[PDB]
mmCIF file of C-alpha atoms in Angstrom:
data_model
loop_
_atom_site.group_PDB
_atom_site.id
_atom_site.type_symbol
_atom_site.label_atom_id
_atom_site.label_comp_id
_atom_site.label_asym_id
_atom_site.label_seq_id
_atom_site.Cartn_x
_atom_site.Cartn_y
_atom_site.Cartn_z
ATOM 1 C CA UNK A 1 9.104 28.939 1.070
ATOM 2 C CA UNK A 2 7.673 25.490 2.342
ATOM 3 C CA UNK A 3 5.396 27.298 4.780
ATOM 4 C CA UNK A 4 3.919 29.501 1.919
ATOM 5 C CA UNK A 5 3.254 26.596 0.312
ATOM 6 C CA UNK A 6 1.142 24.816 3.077
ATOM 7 C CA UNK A 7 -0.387 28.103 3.467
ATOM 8 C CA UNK A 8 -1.318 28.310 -0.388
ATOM 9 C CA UNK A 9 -2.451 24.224 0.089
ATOM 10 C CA UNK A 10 -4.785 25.096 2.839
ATOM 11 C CA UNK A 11 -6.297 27.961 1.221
ATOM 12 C CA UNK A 12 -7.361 25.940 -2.065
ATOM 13 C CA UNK A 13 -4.696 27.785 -4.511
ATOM 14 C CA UNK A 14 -3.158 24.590 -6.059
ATOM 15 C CA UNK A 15 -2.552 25.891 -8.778
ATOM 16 C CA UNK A 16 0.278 28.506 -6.858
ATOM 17 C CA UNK A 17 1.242 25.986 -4.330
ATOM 18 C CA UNK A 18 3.007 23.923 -7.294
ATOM 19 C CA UNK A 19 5.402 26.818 -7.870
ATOM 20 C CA UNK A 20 6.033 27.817 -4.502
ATOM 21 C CA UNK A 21 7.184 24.255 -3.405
ATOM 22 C CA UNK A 22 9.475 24.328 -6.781
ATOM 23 C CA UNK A 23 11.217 27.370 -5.231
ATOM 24 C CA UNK A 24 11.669 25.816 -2.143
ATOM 25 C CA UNK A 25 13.643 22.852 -3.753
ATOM 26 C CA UNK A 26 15.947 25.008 -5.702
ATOM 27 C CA UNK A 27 16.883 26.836 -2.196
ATOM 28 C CA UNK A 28 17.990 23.522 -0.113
ATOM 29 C CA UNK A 29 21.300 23.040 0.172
ATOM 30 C CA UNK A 30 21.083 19.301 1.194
ATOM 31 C CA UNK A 31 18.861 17.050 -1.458
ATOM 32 C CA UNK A 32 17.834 14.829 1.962
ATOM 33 C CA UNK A 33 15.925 17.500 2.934
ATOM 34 C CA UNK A 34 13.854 17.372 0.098
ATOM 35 C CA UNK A 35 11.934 13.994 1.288
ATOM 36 C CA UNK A 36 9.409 15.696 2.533
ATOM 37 C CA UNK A 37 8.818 18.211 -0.016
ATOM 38 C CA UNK A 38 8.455 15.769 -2.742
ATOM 39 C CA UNK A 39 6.038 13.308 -1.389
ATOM 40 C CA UNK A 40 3.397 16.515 -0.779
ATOM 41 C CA UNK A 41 4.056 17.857 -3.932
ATOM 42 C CA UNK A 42 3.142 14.716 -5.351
ATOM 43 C CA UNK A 43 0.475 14.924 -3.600
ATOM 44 C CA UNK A 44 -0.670 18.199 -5.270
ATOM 45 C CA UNK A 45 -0.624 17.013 -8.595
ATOM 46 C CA UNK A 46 -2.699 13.711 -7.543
ATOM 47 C CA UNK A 47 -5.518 16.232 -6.776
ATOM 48 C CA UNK A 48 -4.635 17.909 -9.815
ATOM 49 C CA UNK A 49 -5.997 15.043 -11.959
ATOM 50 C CA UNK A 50 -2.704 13.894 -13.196
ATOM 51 C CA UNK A 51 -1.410 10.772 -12.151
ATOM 52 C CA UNK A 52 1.148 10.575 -14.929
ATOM 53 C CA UNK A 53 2.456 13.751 -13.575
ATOM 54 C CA UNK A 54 3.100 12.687 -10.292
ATOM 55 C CA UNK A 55 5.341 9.332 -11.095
ATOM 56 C CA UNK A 56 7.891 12.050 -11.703
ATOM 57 C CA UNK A 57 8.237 12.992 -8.654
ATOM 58 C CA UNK A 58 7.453 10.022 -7.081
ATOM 59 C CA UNK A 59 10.719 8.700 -8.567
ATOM 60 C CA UNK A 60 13.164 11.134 -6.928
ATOM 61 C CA UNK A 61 11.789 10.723 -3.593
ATOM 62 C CA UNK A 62 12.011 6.580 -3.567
ATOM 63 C CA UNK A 63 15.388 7.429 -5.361
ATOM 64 C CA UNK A 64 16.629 9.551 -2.556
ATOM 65 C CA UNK A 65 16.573 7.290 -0.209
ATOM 66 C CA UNK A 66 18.938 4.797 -2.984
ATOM 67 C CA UNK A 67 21.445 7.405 -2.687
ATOM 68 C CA UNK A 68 21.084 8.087 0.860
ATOM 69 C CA UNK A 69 22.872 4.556 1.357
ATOM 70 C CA UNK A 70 19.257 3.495 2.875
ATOM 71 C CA UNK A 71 18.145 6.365 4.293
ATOM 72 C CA UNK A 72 14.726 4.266 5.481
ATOM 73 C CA UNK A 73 12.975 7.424 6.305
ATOM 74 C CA UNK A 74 9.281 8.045 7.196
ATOM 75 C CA UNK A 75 7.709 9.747 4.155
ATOM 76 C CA UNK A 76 9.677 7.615 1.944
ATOM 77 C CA UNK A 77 7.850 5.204 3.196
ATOM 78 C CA UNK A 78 4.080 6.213 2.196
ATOM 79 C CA UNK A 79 6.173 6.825 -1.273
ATOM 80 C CA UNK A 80 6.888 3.365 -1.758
ATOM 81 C CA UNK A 81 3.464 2.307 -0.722
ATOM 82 C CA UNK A 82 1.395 4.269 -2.967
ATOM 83 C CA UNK A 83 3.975 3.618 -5.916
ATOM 84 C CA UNK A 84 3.728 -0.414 -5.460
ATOM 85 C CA UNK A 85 -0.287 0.457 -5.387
ATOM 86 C CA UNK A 86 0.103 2.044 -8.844
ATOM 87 C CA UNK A 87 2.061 -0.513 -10.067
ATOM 88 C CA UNK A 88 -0.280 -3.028 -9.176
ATOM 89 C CA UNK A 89 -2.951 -1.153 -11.586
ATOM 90 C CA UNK A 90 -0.560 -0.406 -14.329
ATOM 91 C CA UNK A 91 -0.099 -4.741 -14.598
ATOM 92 C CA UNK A 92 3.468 -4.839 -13.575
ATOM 93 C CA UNK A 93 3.742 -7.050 -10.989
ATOM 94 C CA UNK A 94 7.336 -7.748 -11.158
ATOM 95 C CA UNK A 95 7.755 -3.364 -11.002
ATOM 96 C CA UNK A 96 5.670 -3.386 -7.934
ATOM 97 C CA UNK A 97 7.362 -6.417 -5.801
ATOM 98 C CA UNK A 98 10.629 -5.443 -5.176
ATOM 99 C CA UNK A 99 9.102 -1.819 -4.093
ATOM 100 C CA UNK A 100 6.820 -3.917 -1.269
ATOM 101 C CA UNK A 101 10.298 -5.622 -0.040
ATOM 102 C CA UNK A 102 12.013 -2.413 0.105
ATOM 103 C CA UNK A 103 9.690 -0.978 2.795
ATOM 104 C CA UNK A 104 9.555 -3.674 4.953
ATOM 105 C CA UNK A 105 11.314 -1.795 7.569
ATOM 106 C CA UNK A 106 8.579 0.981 8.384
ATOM 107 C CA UNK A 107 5.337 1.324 10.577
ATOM 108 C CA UNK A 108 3.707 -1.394 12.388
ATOM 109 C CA UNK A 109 0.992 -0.583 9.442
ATOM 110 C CA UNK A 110 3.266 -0.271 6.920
ATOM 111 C CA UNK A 111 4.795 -3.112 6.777
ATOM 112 C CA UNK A 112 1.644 -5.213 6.677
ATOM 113 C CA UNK A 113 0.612 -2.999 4.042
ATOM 114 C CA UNK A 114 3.538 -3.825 1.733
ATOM 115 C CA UNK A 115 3.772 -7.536 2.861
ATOM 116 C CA UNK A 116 -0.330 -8.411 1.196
ATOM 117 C CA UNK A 117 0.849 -6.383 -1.538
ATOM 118 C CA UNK A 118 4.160 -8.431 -2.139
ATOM 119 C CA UNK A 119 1.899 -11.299 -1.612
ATOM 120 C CA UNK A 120 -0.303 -9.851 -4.632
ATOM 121 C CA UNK A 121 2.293 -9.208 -6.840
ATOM 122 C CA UNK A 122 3.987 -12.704 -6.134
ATOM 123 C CA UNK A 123 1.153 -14.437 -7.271
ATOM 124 C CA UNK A 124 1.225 -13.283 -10.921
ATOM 125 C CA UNK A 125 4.682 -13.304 -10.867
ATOM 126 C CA UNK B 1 -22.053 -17.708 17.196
ATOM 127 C CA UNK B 2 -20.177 -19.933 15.071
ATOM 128 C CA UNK B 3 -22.470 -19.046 11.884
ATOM 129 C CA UNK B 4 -21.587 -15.693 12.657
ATOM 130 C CA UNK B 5 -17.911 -16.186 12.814
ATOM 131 C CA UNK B 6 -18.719 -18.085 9.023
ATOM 132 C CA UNK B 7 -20.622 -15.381 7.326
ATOM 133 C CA UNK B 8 -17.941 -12.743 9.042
ATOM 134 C CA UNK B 9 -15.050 -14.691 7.585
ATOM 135 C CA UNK B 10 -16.871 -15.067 4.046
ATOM 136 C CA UNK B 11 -17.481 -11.685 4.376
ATOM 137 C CA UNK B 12 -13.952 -9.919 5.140
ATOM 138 C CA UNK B 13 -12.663 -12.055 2.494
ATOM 139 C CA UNK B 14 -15.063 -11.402 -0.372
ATOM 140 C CA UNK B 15 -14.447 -12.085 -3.680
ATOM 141 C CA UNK B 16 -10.743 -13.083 -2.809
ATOM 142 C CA UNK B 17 -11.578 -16.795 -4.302
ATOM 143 C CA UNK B 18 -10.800 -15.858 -7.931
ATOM 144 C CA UNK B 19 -7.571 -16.720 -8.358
ATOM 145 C CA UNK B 20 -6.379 -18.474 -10.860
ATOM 146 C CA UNK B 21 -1.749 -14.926 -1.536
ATOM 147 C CA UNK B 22 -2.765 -17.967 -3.279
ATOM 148 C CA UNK B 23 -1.139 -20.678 -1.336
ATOM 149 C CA UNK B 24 -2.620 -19.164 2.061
ATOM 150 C CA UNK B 25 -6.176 -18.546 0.037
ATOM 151 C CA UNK B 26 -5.639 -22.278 -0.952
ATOM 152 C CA UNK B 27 -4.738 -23.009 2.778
ATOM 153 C CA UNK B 28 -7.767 -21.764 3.758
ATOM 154 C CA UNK B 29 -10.095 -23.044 0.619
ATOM 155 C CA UNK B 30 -8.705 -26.820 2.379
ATOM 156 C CA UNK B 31 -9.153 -26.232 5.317
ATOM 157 C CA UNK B 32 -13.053 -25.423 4.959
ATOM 158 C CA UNK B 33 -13.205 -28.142 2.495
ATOM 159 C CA UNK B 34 -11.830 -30.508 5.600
ATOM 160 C CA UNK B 35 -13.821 -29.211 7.954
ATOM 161 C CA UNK B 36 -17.216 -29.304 5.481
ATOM 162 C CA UNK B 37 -16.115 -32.774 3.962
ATOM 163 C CA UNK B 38 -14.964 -34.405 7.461
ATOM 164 C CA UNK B 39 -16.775 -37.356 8.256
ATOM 165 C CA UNK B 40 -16.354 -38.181 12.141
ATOM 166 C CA UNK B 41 -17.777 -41.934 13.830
ATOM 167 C CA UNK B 42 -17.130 -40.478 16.957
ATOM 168 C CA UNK B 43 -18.309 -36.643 17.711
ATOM 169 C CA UNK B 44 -15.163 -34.670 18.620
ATOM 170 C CA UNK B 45 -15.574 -32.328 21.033
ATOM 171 C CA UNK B 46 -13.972 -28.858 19.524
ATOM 172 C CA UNK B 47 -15.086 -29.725 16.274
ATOM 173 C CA UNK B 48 -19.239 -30.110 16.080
ATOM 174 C CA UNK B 49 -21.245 -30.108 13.063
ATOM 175 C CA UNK B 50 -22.634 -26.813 14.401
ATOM 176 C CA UNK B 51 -19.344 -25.356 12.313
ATOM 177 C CA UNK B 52 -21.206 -27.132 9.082
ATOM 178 C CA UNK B 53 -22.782 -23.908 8.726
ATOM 179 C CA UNK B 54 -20.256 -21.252 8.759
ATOM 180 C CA UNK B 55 -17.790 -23.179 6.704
ATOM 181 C CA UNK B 56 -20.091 -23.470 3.957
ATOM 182 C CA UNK B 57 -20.746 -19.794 4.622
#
């Protein structure tokens, strides 16, 4: 079901991509392996010109990794980084700075990316 | 060179002065400030007026 999906994503049919990824998370047995699904199909709806949409989602993945005791995994972390960024233009700092501290722990490019953000958000703290 | 290094520095860093990060923005608004305000008897060697320029930049 995933691969339909990336199929459907690289043939511009967004709109059936959504539905096919949704069937795919109802058919895991493990909710870890659904880190991956959910920061894609975030991505879908973020080119679906719905950002509200998307927090949704955006939520359970960061949330995952809670309950994972830590998981700290890769495509958490681009989760955390675009989520602080949101945060940032929605005006809560104080939202946004403990999501920057969280991913401290990732790429060499990650980590700088969350660190000028926590920076940001410190200062109107 | 060194005006280059000024306007490249102003320039990465654009419109990063309007804050009301801060205390390493600050670090850096004093330390031009020293290096435009600093009045030497004696010319220092790694330190020229020919980085007047750039700072101001």
């Amino acid at each position: 079901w995933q691969v339909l999906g990336e199929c459907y994503s690289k043939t511009g049919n967004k709109v059936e991509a959504i539905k096919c990824y949704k069937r795919s998370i109802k058919a895991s047995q493990t909710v870890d392996q659904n880190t991956s699904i959910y920061y894609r199909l975030a991505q879908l709806y973020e080119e679906l010109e719905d950002l509200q949409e998307c927090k949704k989602f955006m939520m359970k993945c960061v949330d995952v990794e809670e309950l994972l005791e830590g998981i700290v995994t890769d495509e958490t972390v681009k989760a955390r980084l675009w989520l602080a960024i949101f945060e940032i233009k929605a005006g809560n700092y104080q939202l946004a700075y403990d999501y920057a501290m969280g991913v401290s722990s990732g790429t060499s490019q990650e980590i700088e990316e969350a660190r000028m953000l926590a920076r940001e958000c410190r200062r109107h703290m | 060179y060194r005006l280059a290094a000024g306007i490249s520095l102003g320039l990465i860093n654009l419109g990063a002065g309007q804050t009301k990060q801060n205390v390493m923005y600050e670090d850096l608004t004093t330390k031009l400030l020293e290096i435009v305000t600093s009045t030497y008897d004696v010319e220092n060697d790694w330190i020229p007026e020919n980085s007047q320029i750039g700072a101001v930049i």
